[PDB]
Amino acid sequence: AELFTNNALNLVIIFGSCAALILMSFWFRRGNRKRKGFLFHAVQFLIYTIIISAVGSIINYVIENYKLKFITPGVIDFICTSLIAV
Amino acid sequence: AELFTNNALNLVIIFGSCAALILMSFWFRRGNRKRKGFLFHAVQFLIYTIIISAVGSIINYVIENYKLKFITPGVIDFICTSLIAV
Ligand SMILES: CCCCCCCCCCCC
Numbered sequence: 001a002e003l004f005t006n007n008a009l010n011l012v013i014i015f016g017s018c019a020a021l022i023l024m025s026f027w028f029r030r031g032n033r034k035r036k037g038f039l040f041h042a043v044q045f046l047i048y049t050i051i052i053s054a055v056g057s058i059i060n061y062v063i064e065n066y067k068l069k070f071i072t073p074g075v076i077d078f079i080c081t082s083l084i085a086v
Numbered sequence: 087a088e089l090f091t092n093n094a095l096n097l098v099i100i101f102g103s104c105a106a107l108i109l110m111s112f113w114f115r116r117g118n119r120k121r122k123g124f125l126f127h128a129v130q131f132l133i134y135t136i137i138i139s140a141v142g143s144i145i146n147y148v149i150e151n152y153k154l155k156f157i158t159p160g161v162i163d164f165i166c167t168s169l170i171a172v
């Protein structure tokens with residue numbers, strides 16, 4: 001409830017990125033004039049990176065603003081780096 | 087109102103840079119003795135850099151002097167660096 005005030009831009013940009021991804025998927029599906037090689041993979045990579053960074057920021061804010069017990073900060077950064085590297 | 091006292095030179099230099107840009111655009115349009123290659127592009131680049139740096143400074147001052155909630159300092163520096171690099 002009260003946590004949404006400080007993160008609204010984050011969900012806004014997450015939704016915008018997802019909508020842009022769906023729109024460009026449809027754009028590729030229509031006509032398929034492009035080649036789905038390195039550029040489309042790179043686009044997927046960057047959108048994945050930004051969305052997981054946003055999710056990690058949300059987790060950090062929730063942990064730091066609600067309760068610090070049972071969660072160690074920075075470990076979520078490690079998991080995000082691991083996922084993007086994978 | 088009260089924030090204009092500490093930023094007056096910034097809007098002054100922004101307006102001066104815009105006026106100089108328009109004046110040099112007109113000067114190029116008159117006679118076009120020059121070649122609009124690397125030098126004019128570099129002039130555009132430097133004026134863009136200085137105006138966005140001024141805007142970022144204004145945003146920083148507004149955030150630090152009005153309310154720190156919902157805005158993370160330094161992210162605007164990241165966005166300015168990203169825009170100038172692009
Ligand atoms: C059909 C031709 C496709 C050519 C794709 C080139 C991809 C280059 C990737 C370079 C990665 C360093």
Ligand SMILES: CCCCCCCCCCCC
Pocket residue numbers: 121123124
């Ligand atoms: C008509 C001749 C125009 C010559 C423009 C030279 C531009 C050099 C740029 C060097 C960038 C490193």
